[PDB]
Amino acid sequence: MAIDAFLGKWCLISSEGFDEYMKELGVGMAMRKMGSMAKPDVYIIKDGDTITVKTESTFKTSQFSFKLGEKFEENTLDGRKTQTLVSLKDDGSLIQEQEWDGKKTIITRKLVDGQLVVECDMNGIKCVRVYQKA
Ligand SMILES: CCCCCC/C=C\CCCCCCCC(=O)O
């Protein structure tokens, strides 16, 4: 299905509003600096039905594996532990819903002109990051 379009290694080429989004998530200033400086690689890998989103950089490494439609606890880049659900819309964009501590954030990923466009919302605070195929 549509997930195959996402598969591969992706390199950050732009980031906008990420500091404000990280602020809303509760990230400390140093870690926010790491996030602003980072230009990470993101691997979206699938084998069998299991998908992995693996985020690599000099500062921090993170990874989460899951099946589509099946909830799971995620350890996030900033050290949150969330209940996450990941789904594909008819669009079909990839939606990742995260819930923790009575809070909620939504990260969408779509392909626009061959680029992975990631849009995150937290309390109407918006951020968008774009990756290029490696
Ligand atoms: C992304 C570079 C990792 C190094 C910086 C780690 C510190 C803060 C990162 C905030 C993580 C929360 C937002 C991640 C969501 C996303 O990447 O789509």
CB of 107 within 8 A of CB of 4?
Answer: no
Please name the amino acid found at residue 55.
Answer: T
Task: Indicate the angle between helix axes 18-25 and 29-37, nearest 10 degrees.
Answer: 150
Q: Is 57 touching ligand 1 by the criterion CB < 6 Å?
A: yes
The domain ranges of the chain are 1-134
Q: Is 35 touching ligand 1 by the criterion CB < 6 Å?
A: yes
CB of 125 within 8 A of CB of 17?
Answer: yes
Q: How far is CA 26 from the centre of its chain?
A: 17
Give the number of residues written for the chain. 134
**What is the b/e burial string over 89-114, where b = at least 16 CB atoms within 10 angstroms of the residue's CB?**
eeeebbbbbbebeeeebebbbbeeee
CB of 55 within 8 A of CB of 77?
Answer: yes
CB-based contacts of 80-88 (< 8 A; 24+ apart in sequence): 80/25, 86/51, 88/1, 88/2, 88/3
CB-based contacts of 88-93 (< 8 A; 24+ apart in sequence): 88/1, 88/2, 88/3, 91/2, 92/1, 92/2
Report which of 54, 56, 57 is spatially closest to residue 45, judged by C-alpha positions. Answer: 54
Please name the amino acid found at residue 33.
Answer: K
- Identify how the structure was determined: X-ray
Q: Is 120 touching ligand 1 by the criterion CB < 6 Å?
A: yes
Q: Is 41 touching ligand 1 by the criterion CB < 6 Å?
A: no
d(C-alpha 93, C-alpha 108), whole Å: 7
* Distance from residue 18's CA to the centre of ligand 1 (Å): 9
Where does the chain show beta strands of DSSP type E?
8-16, 41-47, 50-56, 62-66, 72-75, 81-88, 94-100, 103-112, 115-122, 125-133
The β-bridge relationship of strands 103-112 and 115-122 is antiparallel
CB of 134 within 8 A of CB of 29?
Answer: no
Q: Count CB neighbours of 1 within 10 A.
A: 7
* Distance from residue 47's CA to the centre of ligand 1 (Å): 25
Q: Which ligand 1 atom sits nearest the alpha carbon of residue 120?
A: 18
In units of Å, what resolution does this entry have?
2.3
CB of 74 within 8 A of CB of 98?
Answer: yes
Give the CATH fold of the 1-134 domain: Lipocalin (2.40.128)
